[PDB]
Amino acid sequence: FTLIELMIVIAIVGILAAVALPAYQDYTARAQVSEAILLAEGQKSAVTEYYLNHGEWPGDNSSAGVATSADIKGKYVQSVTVANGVITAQMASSNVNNEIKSKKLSLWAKRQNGSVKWFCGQPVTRTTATATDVAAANGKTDDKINTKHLPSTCRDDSSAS
Numbered sequence: 001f002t003l004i005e006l007m008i009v010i011a012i013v014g015i016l017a018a019v020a021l022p023a024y025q026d027y028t029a030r031a032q033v034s035e036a037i038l039l040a041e042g043q044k045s046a047v048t049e050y051y052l053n054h055g056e057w058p059g060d061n062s063s064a065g066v067a068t069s070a071d072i073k074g075k076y077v078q079s080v081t082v083a084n085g086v087i088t089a090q091m092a093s094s095n096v097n098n099e100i101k102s103k104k105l106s107l108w109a110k111r112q113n114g115s116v117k118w119f120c121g122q123p124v125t126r127t128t129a130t131a132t133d134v135a136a137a138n139g140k141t142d143d144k145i146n147t148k149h150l151p152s153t154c155r156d157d158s159s160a161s
């Protein structure tokens, strides 16, 4: 070989040392959102029992049978709230992933003639405790967990039935 080959080798070493990386932030966000999903999954029993024994969905954490929203917290979750039978979880505003800072995800259920189906996805709202339909959360806010930061199973629309 000669000097040109060595220079090319050094250039290739620099090229390899200055390479790019894929988007691992999405995977870390999914891993951190799994905790919020697990925390929100634990309030299903109380809401279901109240609905079965009273005929209407709970309107607040008080008669649902759970603690204050500010007390249901984890490493990356800061609040879990129940409103008209809908469970919503909010992530922390610091020491967490940048993409899922102060964002919300929701869980809700619909009653069938022989079963009760549960859904998971972007935030939804219910207007009346005796209603059977849901809609989108808001149009004047940006506190929605992106599709890229959710598992493929936890991607449901408000019109799903």
Ligand SMILES: *[C@@H]1O[C@H](C)[C@@H](NC(=O)[C@H](O)CO)[C@H](O)[C@H]1NC(C)=O
Pocket: 056, 057, 058, 059, 060, 062, 063, 064, 129
């Ligand atoms: C428990 O949640 C119920 C939905 C609520 N009931 C009503 O709001 C009435 O049906 C009028 O809509 C109860 O008042 C709640 N009980 C409490 C807060 O102690």
Ligand SMILES: *OP(=O)(O)OC[C@H](O)CO
Pocket: 068, 069, 070, 071, 079, 080, 081
């Ligand atoms: O009242 P909740 O338990 O839903 O928590 C409220 C929180 O402090 C910010 O909305």
